[PDB]
Write an enzyme that holds these catalytic residues in place. Sequence first.
Site, PDB file in Angstrom:
ATOM      1  N   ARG A 133       0.863  -1.176   0.000  1.00 33.53           N
ATOM      2  CA  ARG A 133       0.000   0.000   0.000  1.00 33.53           C
ATOM      3  C   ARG A 133       0.901   1.227   0.000  1.00 33.53           C
ATOM      4  N   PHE A 138       2.087  10.660   1.438  1.00 31.60           N
ATOM      5  CA  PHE A 138       1.520  10.137   2.677  1.00 31.60           C
ATOM      6  C   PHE A 138       2.463   9.092   3.267  1.00 31.60           C
ATOM      7  N   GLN A 141       3.556   1.465   2.978  1.00 33.40           N
ATOM      8  CA  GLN A 141       3.253   0.458   4.007  1.00 33.40           C
ATOM      9  C   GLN A 141       3.684  -0.941   3.562  1.00 33.40           C
ATOM     10  N   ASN A 180      -1.679  -0.565  12.246  1.00 36.20           N
ATOM     11  CA  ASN A 180      -2.473  -1.335  13.208  1.00 36.20           C
ATOM     12  C   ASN A 180      -3.939  -1.335  12.803  1.00 36.20           C
ATOM     13  N   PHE A 187       4.811   1.387   8.410  1.00 37.49           N
ATOM     14  CA  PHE A 187       4.913   2.309   7.280  1.00 37.49           C
ATOM     15  C   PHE A 187       6.080   3.261   7.425  1.00 37.49           C
ATOM     16  N   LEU A 196      -1.954  11.178  12.576  1.00 36.41           N
ATOM     17  CA  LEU A 196      -1.791   9.820  13.090  1.00 36.41           C
ATOM     18  C   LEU A 196      -1.189   9.800  14.495  1.00 36.41           C
ATOM     19  N   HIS A 200      -0.780   5.729  16.055  1.00 34.95           N
ATOM     20  CA  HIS A 200       0.238   4.777  15.598  1.00 34.95           C
ATOM     21  C   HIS A 200       1.547   5.021  16.325  1.00 34.95           C
TER      22      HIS A 200
END
Lengths: 232, 236, 99, 104, 78
Positions: A133, A138, A141, A180, A187, A196, A200
């Site tokens: 991903r 951004f 991952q 998670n 990531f 985030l 995270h």
Amino acid sequence: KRVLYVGGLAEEVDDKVLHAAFIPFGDITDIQIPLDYETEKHRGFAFVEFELAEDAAAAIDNMNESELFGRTIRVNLAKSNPQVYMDIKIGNKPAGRIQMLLRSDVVPMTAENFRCLCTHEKGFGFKGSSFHRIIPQFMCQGGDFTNHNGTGGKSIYGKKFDDENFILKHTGPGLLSMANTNGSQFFLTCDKTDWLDGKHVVFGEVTEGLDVLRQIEAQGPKQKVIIADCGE
Amino acid sequence: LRSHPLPETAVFLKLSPESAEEYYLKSSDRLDEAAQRLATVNDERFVSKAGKSNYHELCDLISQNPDKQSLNVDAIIRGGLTRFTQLGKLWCSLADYYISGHFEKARDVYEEAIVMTVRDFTQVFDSYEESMIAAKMETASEEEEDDVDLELRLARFELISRRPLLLNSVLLRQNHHVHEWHKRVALGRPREIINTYTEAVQPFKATGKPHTLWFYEDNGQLDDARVIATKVNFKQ
Amino acid sequence: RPGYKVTKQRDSEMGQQSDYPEIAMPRHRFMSAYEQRPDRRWQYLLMAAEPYETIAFKVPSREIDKAEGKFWTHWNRETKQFFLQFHFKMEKPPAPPSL
Amino acid sequence: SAFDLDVVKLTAQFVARQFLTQLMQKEYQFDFLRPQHSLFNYFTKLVEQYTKILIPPSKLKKREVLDQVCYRVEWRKKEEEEKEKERVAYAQIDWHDFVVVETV
Amino acid sequence: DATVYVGGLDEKVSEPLLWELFLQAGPVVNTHMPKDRVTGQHQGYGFVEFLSEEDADYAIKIMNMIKLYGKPIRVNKA
């Protein structure tokens, strides 16, 4: 910062010769020499991993452009808090090495999990898995080495482990954070991702190879992005 | 092997039988090293002979150097036996050069077979007629500084052939030390004349040729003139 | 061994007088001639500054002055190991030295 | 951890004044005595501290406290920023706008 | 949180596979997926109102795992 690239190796040079030539600088944990099975000979280069980054540094300074078996060799970085590396392949093409510092001082359990997944010392890990991903501006991952789609992975402790703390924040690109319910998925940030924070666990940072991370981001996947090799 | 280790802790022919039965070879080489160290005469050389019976080979050659002359050449033959060729062979040539001129010239030849060896052989020629041949060949191999070096060789070794090589240096670069290269032929009024004709072909060098046939400050302002309103300075 | 040193000079407050802290040092990079706007096969030590035009220097020798741990591993990457390792920017006089 | 703490601090109390080097031979509890065991370091601290208490065993009659705290106070970000800018621009200029002069 | 913004979609997706898609997580009470009139096609970004807020915060947690036409789907609070 513990892994060194060593090139310009004469045919007679092998892992024994390398061990003997580099051990004067400090203990060595691993020596890899890619081979051509059609010839049974190496391709002229190898990777030497020192136990300590400081020793790897001294070796670079004294061995780069030095003589080994009659010819000049080339030595440089290939790509207390652990440092680990991932060699990245994009499509069929090597992209280079990302080196990462793990913040065992802040999040020891989280750092240790990622460290072990880089070395495979618990019997499983990241080698050969993908960044499944990838979203430009951004994050990239990966770490789902069981299902390869964001539904899998496992930690060295079991399926999942607690959020240790949220001390480290998502302040900019090149940070390592847990996806998670922590398992093995993680990531690498490609910008400040402060939304985030507190959700995270941030646990490390890129120290070399931000450019390789940008090549991964460029695929945000349009082409397969694979962890061709990894370690400490 | 653990029994061999405990037996090693317990630790000559019968002992050799116990050791060979215990086996591995690296421990035996370590034992031969222990003998070479403990003996530190001829008996040690006998230990080297038993070591030869056992079969790092360059290290054995180092022990042979510690034994120090034809036998040493035989040890060099053993070093040749050790491998077809990489740095350890260079160490063998190094021991060959450090101490029988043929022993060094042969290693310099094998080094010539594979450019650094040609450089060390050039150093051997620098140590010296044959070395002069190696040096002149090194210059003629086909740089103005090297031409100065060959001119220095003419100043040392050895005349018309030197004039020919000087003709080669002249054709290679018609620019002001060439008259000095001609001066070696004078060893001088004629070489100075060549320095004068070269000056016509272009300062003090012709005067030096005149002395050879037989103020430096003004010669220096003249050198400023010799540099490649400025023309007015050349006039002043 | 032997290394190369370049001394690049810049304007004498002639046109830079027209200063809004917008990135207001020069940067160097090694580029392969494999990409050009015919022939190729050598490297160039390109040097760039915002207003002025880029500059290149051909490097036939595979390696020169490529040192080995010159300083004691201090990590301010700036742009890259090359720039911090071997460049100086006399900003007061506008002289960029590279070696 | 109260046990470990207590033994460290006690052996540190005595060690601060030969009794430990005898205890070790007389009696795996004191495994922190070797510099190998991590805790050893903290030990070296405690002892030092106790060693210090033995220093002025003299009263402390310390304005002054304030002055001191100021002096202690007296005893990077921007740089990081500039570096960032540099990285941006370097990454953002045409390395294909060549116009060379010579070669070495 | 009752509503979410959803980016990066392909027009073969419509309001129905969003309906079905996000109710897989939890029911979308009010769906909004613009139909552009001029060229008669979708840009692919969405707004979702739920029953209450808890639905939608769990939705923040779980929600961005959806992949529409091999491609990534943005879900954030609003």
